[PDB]
Write an enzyme that holds these catalytic residues in place. Structure first.
Site, PDB file in Angstrom:
ATOM      1  CD  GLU A 172      40.167  35.058  34.235  1.00 41.50           C
ATOM      2  OE1 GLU A 172      39.175  35.279  33.511  1.00 41.50           O
ATOM      3  OE2 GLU A 172      40.127  34.228  35.157  1.00 41.50           O
ATOM      4  CD  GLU A 198      39.576  34.422  38.887  1.00 42.58           C
ATOM      5  OE1 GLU A 198      38.654  33.947  38.190  1.00 42.58           O
ATOM      6  OE2 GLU A 198      39.882  35.694  38.847  1.00 42.58           O
ATOM      7  NE  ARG A 223      44.380  36.884  41.381  1.00 42.89           N
ATOM      8  CZ  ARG A 223      43.460  36.918  40.417  1.00 42.89           C
ATOM      9  NH1 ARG A 223      42.471  36.039  40.383  1.00 42.89           N
ATOM     10  NH2 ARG A 223      43.589  37.817  39.451  1.00 42.89           N
ATOM     11  CE1 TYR A 266      35.821  29.920  38.314  1.00 42.32           C
ATOM     12  CE2 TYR A 266      37.308  30.935  36.723  1.00 42.32           C
ATOM     13  CZ  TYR A 266      36.677  30.963  37.957  1.00 42.32           C
ATOM     14  OH  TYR A 266      36.828  32.027  38.822  1.00 42.32           O
ATOM     15  CG  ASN A 300      42.451  32.904  37.071  1.00 41.93           C
ATOM     16  OD1 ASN A 300      43.227  32.700  37.990  1.00 41.93           O
ATOM     17  ND2 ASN A 300      41.909  34.078  36.881  1.00 41.93           N
ATOM     18  CG  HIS A 323      39.889  41.389  38.273  1.00 37.94           C
ATOM     19  ND1 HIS A 323      38.720  40.943  37.710  1.00 37.94           N
ATOM     20  CD2 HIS A 323      40.431  40.327  39.010  1.00 37.94           C
ATOM     21  CE1 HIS A 323      38.610  39.637  38.075  1.00 37.94           C
ATOM     22  NE2 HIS A 323      39.630  39.261  38.852  1.00 37.94           N
TER      23      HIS A 323
END
Length: 426
Positions: free
Chosen positions: A161, A335, A72, A281, A279, A116
């Site tokens: 995002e 991600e 990616r 985290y 994504n 991005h």
């Protein structure tokens, strides 16, 4: 579908390429933002990053060595159209064309992100994402890239995002272009989504086989259901609900400013996709607050990374379970990763046991959601290698490979060896 699960790594153009003022590239909003004192923790910029524009063959060989089967990456809009619209930059197109050929030659599926965060500065000068015209410029850019690359690149994601681009870029001011204005952020959010929707049709007409978008999620937890729901609407539903044809969620803001939604925009935004990139985290933990966004963020319950981001692998399980119920398309974790302190002193393998443990637990959680029924078709570590981490500069390291920036040497971390094993694990 009968494809094998895709094990990948993720990067992005400004974070790794360097060659910021070479071979015709125009400036992005990040090139300008990084010139502002205080914008970047260490006073650094993307030049030269990981020198990937020159070192891409080495980097592909690293991927091949781990058994990675998908990569990616992003295309830098200002490397293709230096002024955002009009002029085409042939050397920029040629670079990505060659990159794609080399990925295919190494058995690696290209997984391409169009946007991005590196908006051409020339478009920012005219209002950037606050101007509706930027959405149309984005769709023209998307079309151009697909016309060049869609014969070989199966997967195109429009946006990475958009929550970050809108709210960090325009409300908190922490990301380029550095604005601090809720109305600006809501205009940006809408024209990001509009640009996505316009681009879907442009991409399909130009031969893109699989079209999607990449959204970040911060699952919300807390004592008070109302505060939790406000946070959920802001972080998680704000962009997802429009893409699903559900409109914007009830506003999470007190007395919000006008949003420039025109007739039929939401129909464009909700054009059907082939996949959603996820994504993740960390979760957010919230209490009621009095601000325009009426929540207060609470520090982590327990272990956190060097970002101060809570380590909560079961959050990825619960998120994927939720998305599997709500999203009618396949999912890819586009991600997931962690920053812990790494400092190379010449060793052959940089030992990063906390990163290994983070990745192991998140992969277990994601694969367990998949086993139960979630149509999770791949997982991408952020990142292949340490790179320019936005407002943190080179002070936060996410790579499987350590990069000694002065020499550009790549040194495997223990997590690189772990990932090779994990990919191959029975």
């Amino acid at each position: 579908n009968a494809e094998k699960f895709l094990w990948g790594v993720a990067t992005s153009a400004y974070q790794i390429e360097g060659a910021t003022q070479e071979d015709g590239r125009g400036p992005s909003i990040w090139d300008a933002f990084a010139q502002r004192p205080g914008a970047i923790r260490d006073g650094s910029t993307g030049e030269p990053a990981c020198d990937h524009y020159r070192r891409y063959e080495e980097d592909i060989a690293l991927m091949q060595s781990l058994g990675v089967r998908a990569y990616r990456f992003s295309v830098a809009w200002p490397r293709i159209l230096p002024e955002g619209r009009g002029r085409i930059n042939p050397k920029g197109l040629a670079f990505y064309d060659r990159l794609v050929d080399r990925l295919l030659a190494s058995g690696i599926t290209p997984f391409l992100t169009l946007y991005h965060w590196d908006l051409p500065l020339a478009l920012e000068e005219r209002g950037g994402w606050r101007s509706r015209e930027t959405a149309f410029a984005f769709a023209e850019y998307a079309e151009a890239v697909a016309r060049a690359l869609a014969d070989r690149v199966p997967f195109f994601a429009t946006l990475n995002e958009p929550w970050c681009s809108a709210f960090l870029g325009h409300w908190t001011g922490e990301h380029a272009p550095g604005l601090r204005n809720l109305e600006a952020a809501l205009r940006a959010a809408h024209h990001l989504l509009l640009g996505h929707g316009l681009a879907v049709e442009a991409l399909r007409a130009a031969g893109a086989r699989r079209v999607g978008i990449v959204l970040n999620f911060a699952p919300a937890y807390g004592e008070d259901p109302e505060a939790v729901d406000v946070a959920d609407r802001y972080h998680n539903r704000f962009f997802l609900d429009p893409i699903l044809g559900k409109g914007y969620p009830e506003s999470p803001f007190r007395d919000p400013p006008p949003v420039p939604i025109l007739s039929r925009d939401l129909e464009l935004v909700a054009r059907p996709l082939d996949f959603l990139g996820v994504n993740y985290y960390a979760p957010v933990r919230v209490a009621p607050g009095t601000g325009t966004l009426p929540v207060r963020y609470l520090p982590p319950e327990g272990p956190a990374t060097a970002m101060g981001w809570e380590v909560y692998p079961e959050g990825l399980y619960h998120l994927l379970k939720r998305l599997g119920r709500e999203v009618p398309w396949p999912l890819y974790v586009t991600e997931n990763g962690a920053a812990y302190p790494d400092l190379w002193t010449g060793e052959a393998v940089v030992e990063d046991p906390e990163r290994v443990a983070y990745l192991e637990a998140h992969v277990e959680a994601a694969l367990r959601a998949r086993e139960e029924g979630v149509d999770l078709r791949g997982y991408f570590v952020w990142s292949l290698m340490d790179n320019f981490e936005w407002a943190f500069g080179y002070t936060r390291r996410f790579g499987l490979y350590y990069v000694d920036f002065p020499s550009q040497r790549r040194i495997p971390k223990r997590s690189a060896l772990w990932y090779r094993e994990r990919i191959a694990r029975a």
